[PDB]
Amino acid sequence: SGFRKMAFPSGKVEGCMVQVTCGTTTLNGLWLDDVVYCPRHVICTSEDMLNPNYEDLLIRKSNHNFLVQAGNVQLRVIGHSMQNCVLKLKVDTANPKTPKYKFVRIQPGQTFSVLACYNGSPSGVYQCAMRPNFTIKGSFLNGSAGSVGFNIDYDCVSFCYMHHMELPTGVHAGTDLEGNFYGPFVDRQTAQAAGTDTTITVNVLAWLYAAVINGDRWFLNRFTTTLNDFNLVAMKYNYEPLTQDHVDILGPLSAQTGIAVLDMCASLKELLQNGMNGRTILGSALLEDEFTPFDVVRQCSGVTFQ
């Protein structure tokens, strides 16, 4: 068998993507039923980015100032309101291809698929993780604002991320679909910096279980460790603390492989103190921390969607 970074199958979302143009500024919107959701900075010009007073600028806009295009079909805007950092444009036709959907706010360490779009058209899909410092490591050019991240469960799409901005260190920041920013960021071209990032230990343990399941077992030692001693070592290498809840979440993988969690912890501790000595795991020379336990179970058990 095999192990690859896998994105959810798309299509349900692509039928929802539109172009929104306000004067010279253009970005992407999400068309669900008779409402289009888009970033509110679309109503700003290039000078406005320094210190935009959004209330003043939005009071001066009428319905006709918004040009919304779904491929060839122009949609008439008949109302608009602002919720936090997102605009909501009421349009006069409901989207016939609207899927079953939910809005969710994810926790750091969780993963999702991103559909990168430009000028209302999709360019590609890829998976990313929410880093402990509330950034993501994506791939986004000018024009990509309004692209969304999502998860699928059977038939229900959970939208969790709308893209807004790029930071100095080449990381990316955005909001949930209710318009609240992830992390301490603001939609302004000001000095902002990502904080110290940490490594998601539970994801590394999931990846080592994936490796064991795929037959890469050279790193298994014969020792065990205590939780407190492990976290003493982990803290020195800028790893997050392992909690008892995390230990319980790894239970199914442990049962599947017959390897207790604390043995994997001892093996990770040895990898951390001694390196990989030129060896690779799953084709990688670095430890990978962007697979949740659910991702591993899904890929190794082959869960499908209607």
Binding site: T24, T25, Y118, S144, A145, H164, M165, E166, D187, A191
Partner: peptide, 10 residues
């Protein structure tokens, strides 16, 4: 280093 808001152009 200032942030770049990644909106496009018409």
């Amino acid at each position: 280093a200032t942030v770049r808001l990644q909106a496009g152009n018409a």
